[PDB]
């Protein structure tokens, strides 16, 4: 048992632990036993749920897209027709997860993905199709499919998972960053140029996912909604950071919208009100 | 008293100057186990490990603060700047010494804080980027009290130019310069990066922010300003990949 | 074939299950881990760092002044500030402690409250910082305040007082969200003697208040934070 | 009280690692050192 | 602080009335109405406001909205009167 | 083998074990061997089914709600439309379980939940949809979703389980009470106030469950009935209590209705009738 | 005979007074392993560990019974009450001594029972609450034979004011005062709670109920009443979190 | 893949099965158990306490 | 005659605990003690 508080009686100390200098930038560990007479209590607590592995470590929906299974004859832009959809993987699009991750500067983790496909048939349909989804992980910078039945889907190298709509797929992706950790913040440019983009960098490329319904068309249209869930595991985090206070406006940037509302709540009363 | 002598430079302080070493980690040379670049690194002598004094800022009653980015602020400082421009890769720690003296009648409190990867926000919103010239200002740094510029960062000190609240900036290595207590702040910064060494030109490892928290209140009839002076010494600096001098904008 | 019986919950996607899963990149070798300073193992490590409290949250907008607690000269037996101790709310909502606290439902342990004086060196002041444990109202006079946990602070060469708010509760855990039963009490500061400014100086001097957690701090049940919201997915 | 067999060859496939025992906040709370005891290399 | 709407209502004997309980707290844990009357919580989204259809009011009653919100008064009474 | 009864012959005892004083409040363990001549028998019985773990320890339906999958376009109150439903978890709504638990004052247990979803299509439908339910456990006091497709459902922290309608989900929740045990009875208030609620307390907050059908709408309406089953395990119980005799009227209160029927059966005959 | 002397108080009993110790557990101070509150507890002296006699009730032929709630009944009793009001937290055991003497011609039987967490039912039904003033009556307690009040508890002794039958109240620690046998009952109550210590004002740990089971039958021509007197002594009492005196309603 | 054969009853919800199940709150640390008097292990313990019989149930 | 492997890291995930061996009703049936043998602390 780890002691939380030690028994401590009256103190006529000349080594005043309660007078310090915050000018130094140190949080001296002053305990209750230093300013009040205390009893001896035990922790009964390990702090398992505050470990970064747990704090940043449950599955969160990080992308949602709808794709369709329909007659593809006579369509030029299959992407526009929502026959397939791709998505550059990023954990920045959902703000809860982004703020949690942005509590740190550098983060290293392996990715466990869960893809949930759910079918809907809004228009008249005689039955529910037994559709199969192909979720193709394309490595960073690899060509995405350009049409629904492109040969890119038959890639001999791109990892692909085939699963029924209504069911899930699960697969882990190791940490794929070039550097020893992802740069959740980058104060630099890709090169010394006057006009080049700031912050957003290729260091944090985690890949991309393409989705299509493998089935040929039925007589009716089926709408499939794909939810990608990411779970970070084997998490390592460095350099704690000031938490995000203002809304986000874009991925990879710290920008916040103009004319934002005040973060700090105003007091109902003066500074003396409880 | 205290005295720090680096090369041909010396800073004496009649205050018992206690130094903050960011994350209790001293600057160190890149060890073999962490190294990726194969070239033998250039470890300069006294020529670079020395105190460079930047031009002083004036702290007025209504000044918001100042921000310097390293190693950008030292890009024009003697031999260090030249080496930073002639080499492809570089890593360095820093000993930052912020100086601001007043009388026992003045009041005010500066927050001196070092932010690794202080990615600045653009004041325009959306996904606009802060241009190179604004994030690499040099020894003048960024004055948070000036007006916005096209392609410049946002300059509301309450939000740290990044969308986080000022009160929370104490999570980073910092020291206060409380005019009643102390006149100097010393922070020793190690090399912080996801990569063992990096390009010194296109990437700023850390940002030094000096922010008035408690405003300057000078005694009656006194001049309503104080100078703030920043002195920096590169520590455990390494350079690799010497070649033709880099060309950067401004 | 090994005879098996599939149980209820088979085929469910529970977002917190944490099992093994096949790798999509077999034989991939990730970049080696280099030493980066400031590694964070546990969030209980970082909540122990003092951050400023926007104690003076009486302004329409967010300003640096929200962090400055005004002190006035020649005030006697008067109150400096007073706040409730719902650490996941009010003045604490935006502090690092409050932010990390809003990610959990339960909290226990002691808090470290600090004040830094920023006035001129030639000033003097004795303040009394009082913690009123729950069950009693927020103290309305200094006499009431000094019956509870308090520290008489003499401002001098040491410009910072650190008062601990001892864990003072029957129930072992309190809710991070404001609740009557799990109320944590009150924090107030009063002039013990007064503030005296030297000649040639006038106006308000300021205190900076800091909050942090003692090493005996606990946070249990993870929840979403209500600090940030979104109605639309973000893009690049 | 608990058992795990590794079913896959990759380290990325294993379940979460658990708790980092040796947690110490002095890195962040007590980063002050006297520079007159020559702690610098 | 806890609030009840309407503050007051006059209603016919045996009739139904909709009483709204609200808090200033955005996320209250306890929020309801105390009354001996048969009531029905109206399906309504949110945590800090509830609506009840108090049915078959026979006497003068004083339904009290209650909550655990510590801001202000955590309880609010409304006054139902019957006319017949 | 544990002895139930020992062989005992004629007794001319002066230490009369059958004369006692119930005024003392003790149930002296008088055995059959004390008042009658007995033979020696064995128990052949451990009492495994009377242990509190078993007595309070099988799955019981503790909540039932119906939700719908229908076209959500042009609806303001999704909760009223039964597109989703939430429920503050409590084991008091079913009287069998409540009386069993109320046999004790303090109870500590971990919760095993089983959610059974069953679909019905009363109106004309061409097929049965392959619907997926999201059961979201929201921690005590956390915000419940306000609309069917609110971002609260994509919470990076709230535990959620996705399962097909017609199938079940199962997940355990540890003991989540603030105090060392749940207060099945609380003779107090949240604070010293004249008007505050009695009995019902936040100490016994076990969380809340929100339910929706993840699927977008089909052409027809599907009615989904969600049954939540709770099973208490690792049960600890203290302070036995007088069993409940009268009907209940509300959760968290000991109130009973006015004009209730007599509990004690009236005798068909006088006190001498067998 | 028996004599119990606590502080400056003494109760003598010419009956061989056998005490019921609830659940065979003596009152004890909170051990370190169970403690959560860190403050050093205040363990009063003789000043509180002593017998406080409440005002006597009259037992008539048609009286239903009486109910006291602890520590509420002692909130106005000498130093204990003051400490209970000045401290935020408190835990205490009790030695309850119920006294009722009669002659060998009287008949009647009192059930003296201690109910932990005796949550009272409201007589109004639905989900109405019993108001603070009724569950904290003080040394007068609740008289079950009086009429109902707006916001008061139900007062049908058959249902124990909670919806359980009277016959079953023997599962709780109890003693009978059978006028033929004994005139006193003694119950030693330990601190019973799900939390190690609690607020003494807003929560009543136990309820003491004195219920006539066998009605009082006085001899012919006798006065048709008997006084019942309750004497309580706090045992192993602890207080924590001293502050301004609490303000409670009534 | 280990060859398996699913048996009858697969996918059934039997309300008395009592198997292991995944936790929805991983790493949660429940409040420590304090000593509370009157712990009940078995219901055969409490039935041994005398309670009154409403023998005169003629009302 | 019986086997259990713990498949999950949490104690809350384990199946029911079984029977409390040491069951003794004297707590409730024989709570009487003479107070003249000074059993009180």
Does residue F142 contact residue E27 with C-beta atoms inside 8 Å? Answer: yes
State the count of interchain CB pairs (< 8 A) between A and H: 15
> Among C133, C139, C171, whose Cβ lies nearest the Cβ of G88?
C133
DSSP string, G46-66: TTTSS-EEPPPEEEETT---E
From chain A residues 42-81, the ones with a CB under 8 A of any chain F CB are 58, 60-61
* Helix (H) or strand (E) run with residue G79 in it: helix G78-86
> Among A110, A172, A240, whose Cβ lies nearest the Cβ of D28?
A240
The neighbouring-strand residues paired with C14 are: F161
> Among G34, G166, G167, whose Cβ lies nearest the Cβ of H34?
G34
Shortest CA distance to B204 belongs to which of B120, B108, B145, B102? Answer: B120
Inform me whether the C-beta atom of residue F60 falls under 8 Å from chain G C-beta atoms.
no
Residues in chain A within 8 Å Cβ distance of F164: 166
**Distance between CA atoms of C204 and C187, rounded to whole angstroms?**
22
3-state DSSP helix/strand/coil % of chain C, to nearest 5: 5, 35, 60
Does residue A94 contact residue A227 with C-beta atoms inside 8 Å? Answer: no
Contacts for E28 with CB less than 8 Å, ≥ 6 apart: E47, E48, E67, E68, E69, F141
Shortest distance between the Cα of G27 and any Cα of chain H, in A, equals 10
**Distance between CA atoms of B109 and B212, rounded to whole angstroms?**
6
Residues in chain I within 8 Å Cβ distance of G188: 35, 40
Query: Nearest residue of H to residue G166 by CA position?
Result: H52
Burial of F124 (0-12, 13-18, 19+ CB in 10 A): exposed
Q: Residue F61: CA atoms inside 13 Å, Cβ hemisphere, count?
A: 10
Query: Nearest residue of G to residue E66 by CA position?
Result: G129
Answer whether F80 sits within 8 Å of E44, measured CB to CB.
yes
What is the total count of domains within chain A?
A: 1
**Distance between CA atoms of G228 and G224, rounded to whole angstroms?**
13
> Among G154, G163, G247, whose Cβ lies nearest the Cβ of F244?
G163
Q: What are phi and psi of G135, to 5 degrees?
A: -90, -10
Query: Nearest residue of H to residue F110 by CA position?
Result: H30
| Tally of CB atoms within 10 A around G13 | 16
Query: Nearest residue of F to residue C176 by CA position?
Result: F141
**Distance between CA atoms of F235 and G141, rounded to whole angstroms?**
36
Q: What are phi and psi of A153, to 5 degrees?
A: -70, -25
Residue ranges of the domains in chain B?
A: 2-242
- For E14-18, the CB contacts below 8 A with 24+ separation are E14/E56, E14/E57, E14/E58, E15/E56, E15/E57, E16/E53, E16/E54, E16/E55, E16/E56, E16/E57, E17/E53, E17/E54, E17/E57, E17/E80, E18/E42, E18/E51, E18/E52, E18/E53, E18/E54
**Distance between CA atoms of C168 and C152, rounded to whole angstroms?**
20
DSSP string, chain A: --EEE--B-----SS-TTEE-GGG-------GGGTS-B--EE------SSBHHHHT-S-EEEEEEEEEE---TT-S-TTTTTSEEEEE--S-SSHHHHHHHTTEEEEEEEEEEEEEEEEE--S--SS----EEEEEEEPTTPPPPSSTT-GGGG-SSS-EEEEETTSEEEEEE----SSSSEESS--B-SSS-SS---S--GGG---EEEEEE-S---SS-EEEEEEEEEEEEEEEEEEE-PPB-S---STT-----TTPPPSSPPPSS-TT--
Inform me whether the C-beta atom of residue H36 falls under 8 Å from chain C C-beta atoms.
no
Residues in chain F within 8 Å Cβ distance of H36: 106, 180-181, 238-239
Residues in chain F within 8 Å Cβ distance of G149: none
| Tally of CB atoms within 10 A around F223 | 16
Does residue G146 contact residue G154 with C-beta atoms inside 8 Å? Answer: no
Shortest distance between the Cα of F216 and any Cα of chain E, in A, equals 20
CA F229 and chain centroid, separation: 9
Query: Nearest residue of H to residue A47 by CA position?
Result: H29
Answer whether F242 sits within 8 Å of G117, measured CB to CB.
no
CA I11 and chain centroid, separation: 18
Answer whether C12 sits within 8 Å of F169, measured CB to CB.
yes
Compute the residue count for chain D: 41
Answer whether A8 sits within 8 Å of G40, measured CB to CB.
yes
Tokens 């018992």 sit on residue: B16
For F230, the 3-state DSSP assignment is: strand
Inform me whether the C-beta atom of residue G148 falls under 8 Å from chain F C-beta atoms.
no
CA distances from F53 to A101, F48, F110, F236, G46 (A): 42, 9, 11, 8, 44
**What one-character DSSP code corresponds to residue C28?**
-
User: Structural domain of residue F270, as residue ranges?
Assistant: 1-274
Residues in chain E within 8 Å Cβ distance of C177: 25, 27, 29
User: Structural domain of residue E49, as residue ranges?
Assistant: 1-84
* Helix (H) or strand (E) run with residue G82 in it: helix G78-86
Shortest CA distance to C64 belongs to which of B145, A27, B135? Answer: B145
**Distance between CA atoms of F149 and G244, rounded to whole angstroms?**
50
The CATH code of domain B2-242 reads: 2.60.120.20
CA distances from E59 to C18, C80, F258 (A): 58, 51, 15
* Helix (H) or strand (E) run with residue F101 in it: helix F95-101
Q: Which of B163, B172, B201 to mutate to test the interface with A (most CBs of A within 10 A)?
A: B163
Q: Which of G18, G19, G116, G235 to mutate to test the interface with I (most CBs of I within 10 A)?
A: G19
Tokens 């969200």 sit on residue: C177
Q: What are phi and psi of A230, to 5 degrees?
A: -110, 135
Burial of H17 (0-12, 13-18, 19+ CB in 10 A): middle
Tokens 């309190």 sit on residue: C174
Shortest distance between the Cα of F202 and any Cα of chain E, in A, equals 7
CA distances from C63 to A82, A126, A263, G109 (A): 47, 62, 10, 74
| Tally of CB atoms within 10 A around C79 | 20
Contacts for H45 with CB less than 8 Å, ≥ 6 apart: I23, I24, I25, I27, I28
Answer whether A17 sits within 8 Å of C162, measured CB to CB.
yes
What is the total count of domains within chain E?
A: 1
Read off the tokens for A24. 């130094």
Inform me whether the C-beta atom of residue G3 falls under 8 Å from chain H C-beta atoms.
no
Shortest distance between the Cα of G249 and any Cα of chain H, in A, equals 31
Answer whether E25 sits within 8 Å of C178, measured CB to CB.
yes
F neighbour chains, 3+ CB pairs within 8 Å: A, C, E, G, H, I
Inform me whether the C-beta atom of residue H35 falls under 8 Å from chain I C-beta atoms.
no
Shortest distance between the Cα of B224 and any Cα of chain A, in A, equals 23
For G22, the 3-state DSSP assignment is: helix
Q: Residue G56: CA atoms inside 13 Å, Cβ hemisphere, count?
A: 11
Experimental method: cryo-EM
Q: For residue F260, is the peptide bond before it cis, meaning its omega torsion is within 30 degrees of 0? A: no
Answer whether D41 sits within 8 Å of B236, measured CB to CB.
yes
Residues in chain E within 8 Å Cβ distance of G129: 34, 66
**Distance between CA atoms of A51 and C42, rounded to whole angstroms?**
4
**Distance between CA atoms of F162 and F145, rounded to whole angstroms?**
16
**Distance between CA atoms of F91 and F104, rounded to whole angstroms?**
14
Inform me whether the C-beta atom of residue C40 falls under 8 Å from chain H C-beta atoms.
no
Q: Which of C169, C215, C217 to mutate to test the interface with G (most CBs of G within 10 A)?
A: C169
Inform me whether the C-beta atom of residue B162 falls under 8 Å from chain C C-beta atoms.
no
G neighbour chains, 3+ CB pairs within 8 Å: A, C, E, F, H, I
Shortest distance between the Cα of F214 and any Cα of chain A, in A, equals 7
Answer whether I9 sits within 8 Å of D3, measured CB to CB.
no
Does residue B61 contact residue B197 with C-beta atoms inside 8 Å? Answer: no
Quick one: CA torsion of B54, B60, B63, B67, rounded to 10 degrees?
10
Contacts for G67 with CB less than 8 Å, ≥ 6 apart: G118, G141, G142, G144, G161, G207, G208, G209, G210
Q: Are 3 or more Cβ–Cβ pairs between F and B shorter than 8 Å?
A: no
3-state DSSP helix/strand/coil % of chain F, to nearest 5: 10, 30, 60
Answer whether A48 sits within 8 Å of H27, measured CB to CB.
yes
The neighbouring-strand residues paired with G209 are: G67, G113
Residues in chain I within 8 Å Cβ distance of F51: 18-20, 23
**Distance between CA atoms of G235 and F151, rounded to whole angstroms?**
55
Answer whether E46 sits within 8 Å of F146, measured CB to CB.
yes
Shortest CA distance to F161 belongs to which of F123, F116, F124? Answer: F116
Residues in chain G within 8 Å Cβ distance of A8: 40
E neighbour chains, 3+ CB pairs within 8 Å: C, F, G
Show which residues on chain I lie within 8 Å of chain H, measured between beta carbons.
Answer: 6-10, 12-16, 19-20, 22-25, 27-29
For strands G19-21 and I32-33, give the pairing.
antiparallel
**Distance between CA atoms of C216 and A40, rounded to whole angstroms?**
12
* Helix (H) or strand (E) run with residue G133 in it: helix G132-135
Kindly provide the b/e burial profile for residues G221-236, where b requires at least 16 CB atoms within 10 angstroms of the residue's own CB: eeeeebebebbbbbbb
For strands D32-33 and B19-21, give the pairing.
antiparallel
Tokens 């546990």 sit on residue: C42
DSSP string, F3-63: EEE--B-----SS-TT---GGG-------GGGTS-B--EE------SSBHHHHT-S-EEEE
Inform me whether the C-beta atom of residue F261 falls under 8 Å from chain G C-beta atoms.
no
């Amino acid at each position: 048992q780890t002691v939380a508080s030690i028994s401590s009686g009256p103190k006529h100390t000349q080594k005043v632990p309660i007078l310090t200098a915050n000018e130094t930038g140190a949080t001296m560990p002053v305990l209750p036993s230093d300013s009040i007479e205390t009893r001896t209590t035990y922790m009964h607590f390990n702090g398992s749920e505050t470990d970064v592995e747990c704090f940043l470590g449950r599955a969160a929906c990080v992308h949602v897209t709808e794709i369709q299974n329909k007659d593809a004859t006579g369509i030029d832009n299959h992407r526009e027709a929502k026959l397939f959809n791709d998505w550059k993987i990023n954990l920045s699009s959902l703000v809860q997860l982004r703020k949690k991750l942005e509590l740190f500067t550098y983060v290293r983790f392996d990715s466990e993905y869960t893809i949930l496909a759910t079918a809907s048939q809004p228009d008249s349909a005689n039955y529910s199709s037994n559709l199969v989804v192909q979720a193709m992980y394309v490595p960073p910078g690899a060509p995405n499919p350009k049409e629904w039945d492109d040969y890119t889907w038959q890639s001999a190298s791109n990892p692909s998972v085939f699963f029924k709509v209504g069911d899930t797929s699960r697969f882990s992706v190791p940490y794929v960053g070039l550097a020893s950790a992802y740069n959740c913040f980058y104060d630099g440019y890709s090169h010394d140029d006057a006009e080049t983009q700031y912050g957003i960098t290729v260091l944090n490329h985690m890949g991309s996912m393409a989705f299509r319904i493998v089935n040929e068309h039925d007589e009716h249209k089926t709408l499939v909604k794909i939810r990608v869930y990411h779970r970070a595991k084997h998490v390592e985090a460095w350099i704690p950071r000031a938490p995000r206070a203002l809304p986000y406006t874009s991925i990879g940037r710290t920008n916040y919208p103009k004319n934002t509302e005040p973060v700090i709540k105003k007091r109902k009363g003066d500074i003396k009100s409880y | 008293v205290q005295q720090i002598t680096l090369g041909n430079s010396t800073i004496t302080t009649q205050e018992a100057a206690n130094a903050v070493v960011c994350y209790a980690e001293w600057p160190e040379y890149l060890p073999d186990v962490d190294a990726s670049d194969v070239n033998k690194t250039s470890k300069p002598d006294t020529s670079v490990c020395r105190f460079y004094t930047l031009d002083s800022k004036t702290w007025t009653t209504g000044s918001k603060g100042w921000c310097w980015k390293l190693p950008d602020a030292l890009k024009d400082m003697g031999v260090f700047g030249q080496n930073m421009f002639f080499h492809s890769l570089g890593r360095s720690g820093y000993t930052v010494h912020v100086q601001c003296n007043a009388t026992k009648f003045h009041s005010g409190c500066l927050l001196v804080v070092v932010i690794p990867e202080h990615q600045l926000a653009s004041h325009e919103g959306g996904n606009v980027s802060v241009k190179y010239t604004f994030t690499h200002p040099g020894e003048r740094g960024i004055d948070l009290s000036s007006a916005n510029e096209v392609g410049g960062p946002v300059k509301d000190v309450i939000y740290n130019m990044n969308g986080t609240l000022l009160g929370n900036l104490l999570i980073f290595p910092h020291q206060f310069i409380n005019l009643r207590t102390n006149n100097t702040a010393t922070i020793v910064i190690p090399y912080i990066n996801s990569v063992p060494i990096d390009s010194m030109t296109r990437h700023n490892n850390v940002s030094l922010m000096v922010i008035p928290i408690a405003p300057l209140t000078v005694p009656t009839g006194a001049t309503p300003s104080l100078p703030i002076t920043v002195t920096i010494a590169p520590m455990c600096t390494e350079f690799s990949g010497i070649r033709s001098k880099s060309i950067v904008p401004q | 074939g090994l005879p098996t019986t599939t149980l209820p919950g088979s085929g469910q996607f529970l977002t917190t299950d944490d099992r093994q899963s096949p790798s999509a990149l077999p034989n991939y070798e990730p970049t080696p881990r280099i030493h980066i300073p400031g590694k964070v193992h546990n969030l209980l490590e970082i909540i122990q760092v003092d951050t400023l409290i926007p104690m003076n949250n009486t302004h329409t907008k967010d300003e640096v002044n929200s962090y400055l607690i005004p002190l006035n000269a020649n005030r006697q037996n008067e109150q400096v500030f007073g706040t409730n101790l719902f650490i996941g709310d009010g003045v604490f909502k935006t502090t690092l402690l409050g932010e990390i606290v809003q990610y959990y439902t339960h909290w226990s342990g002691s808090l470290r409250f600090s004040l830094m004086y920023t006035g001129p060196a030639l000033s003097s002041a004795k303040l009394i910082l009082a913690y009123t444990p729950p069950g009693a109202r927020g103290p309305q006079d200094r006499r009431e305040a000094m019956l509870g946990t308090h520290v008489v602070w003499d401002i001098g060469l040491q410009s910072t007082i650190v008062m601990t708010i001892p864990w003072t509760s029957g129930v072992q855990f309190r809710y991070t969200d404001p609740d009557t039963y799990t109320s944590a009490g009150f924090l107030s500061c009063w002039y013990q003697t007064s503030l005296i400014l030297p000649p040639e100086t006038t106006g308000q001097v300021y205190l900076l208040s800091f909050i942090s957690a003692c090493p005996d701090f606990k946070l249990r049940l993870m929840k979403d934070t209500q600090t940030i919201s979104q109605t639309v997915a973000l893009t690049e | 009280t608990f058992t795990v067999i590794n079913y896959y060859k990759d380290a990325a496939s294993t379940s979460s690692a658990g708790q980092s025992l040796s947690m110490d906040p002095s890195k962040f709370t007590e980063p002050v050192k006297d520079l007159m005891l020559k702690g610098a290399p | 602080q806890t609030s009840v709407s309407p503050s007051k209502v006059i209603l016919p004997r045996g009739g139904s009335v909709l009483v709204t309980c609200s808090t200033s707290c955005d996320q209250p844990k306890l929020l309801g109405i105390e009354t001996p009357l048969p009531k029905k919580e109206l399906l309504l989204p949110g945590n800090n406001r509830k609506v009840y259809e108090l049915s078959n009011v026979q006497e003068d009653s004083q339904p009290m909205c209650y909550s655990n919100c510590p801001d202000g008064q955590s309880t609010a009474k409304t006054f139902l009167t019957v006319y017949w």
